[PDB]
Amino acid sequence: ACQASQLAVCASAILSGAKPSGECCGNLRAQQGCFCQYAKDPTYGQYIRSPHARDTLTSCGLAVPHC
Numbered sequence: 001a002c003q004a005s006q007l008a009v010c011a012s013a014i015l016s017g018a019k020p021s022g023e024c025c026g027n028l029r030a031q032q033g034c035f036c037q038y039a040k041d042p043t044y045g046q047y048i049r050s051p052h053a054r055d056t057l058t059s060c061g062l063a064v065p066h067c
């Protein structure tokens with residue numbers, strides 16, 4: 001299922017713009033199909049939709065979706 005809480009391993013990058021860890025990027029790579037659903041989360045979606053989250057994808061070499 002797509003639960004935002006799955007992104008905890010990337011929280012520093014999403015919340016602060018920190019360079020993402022390798023483990024973060026590997027988790028993001030696996031979980032790409034959830035990204036537009038994560039972006040709709042009422043609690044965390046504001047962070048998921050942010051520039052820091054987008055920058056995290058790009059730092060990980062992943063496409064930024066058009067949700």
Ligand SMILES: CCCCCCCCCCCCCCCC(=O)OCC(O)COP(=O)([O-])OC[C@@H](O)CO
Nearest residue numbers: 035036039040041042043045048049053054065067
């Ligand atoms: C690290 C992963 C990043 C993934 C990035 C995906 C790129 C996101 C691009 C823009 C996304 C737009 C998606 C639609 C977001 C939206 O606003 O609709 C959401 C929605 O209907 C569900 O909840 P919500 O209304 O966002 O709730 C927000 C808030 O007010 C509740 O606290």
